Amino acid sequence: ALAELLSDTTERQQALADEVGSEVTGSLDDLIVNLVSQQWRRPPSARNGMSVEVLIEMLPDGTITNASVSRSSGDKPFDSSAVAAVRNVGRIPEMQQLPRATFDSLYRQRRIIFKPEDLSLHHHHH
Ligand SMILES: [Zn+2]
Numbered sequence: 108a109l110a111e112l113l114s115d116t117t118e119r120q121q122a123l124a125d126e127v128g129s130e131v132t133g134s135l136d137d138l139i140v141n142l143v144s145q146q147w148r149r150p151p152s153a154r155n156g157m158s159v160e161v162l163i164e165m166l167p168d169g170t171i172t173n174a175s176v177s178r179s180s181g182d183k184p185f186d187s188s189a190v191a192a193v194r195n196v197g198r199i200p201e202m203q204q205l206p207r208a209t210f211d212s213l214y215r216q217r218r219i220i221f222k223p224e225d226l227s228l229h230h231h232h233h
């Protein structure tokens with residue numbers, strides 16, 4: 108029965124860890140998006156409907172060490188504007204709130220999709 112109690116408990120933790128997990132990753136992806144939006148300098152060719160995926164590379168202390176296009180929007184100036192915006196954020200020390208294994212698994216190399224309209228939505232400070 109002890110094996111059985113364990114499953115039950117394991118199923119249980121896997122439920123909560125995933126609801127908590129999703130709130131965390133949601134909150135951190137939101138932070139990335141907002142910080143990149145604040146840095147973004149929109150190019151004349153940007154349009155609603157575009158999407159660029161960028162691979163963001165970080166250290167556990169939150170320093171960003173690289174950003175590159177993982178899937179192009181089809182418009183090279185928008186693509187480049189997203190990569191520059193990422194690099195310009197500089198650091199996300201908020202990452203230090205993660206246990207290291209979670210960092211390493213999810214945020215050391217992370218692909219985020221950026222859209223001009225969402226970057227414009229969040230481009231203000233305060
Ligand atoms: Zn505005």
Ligand SMILES: [Zn+2]
Pocket residue numbers: 230
């Ligand atoms: Zn502005």
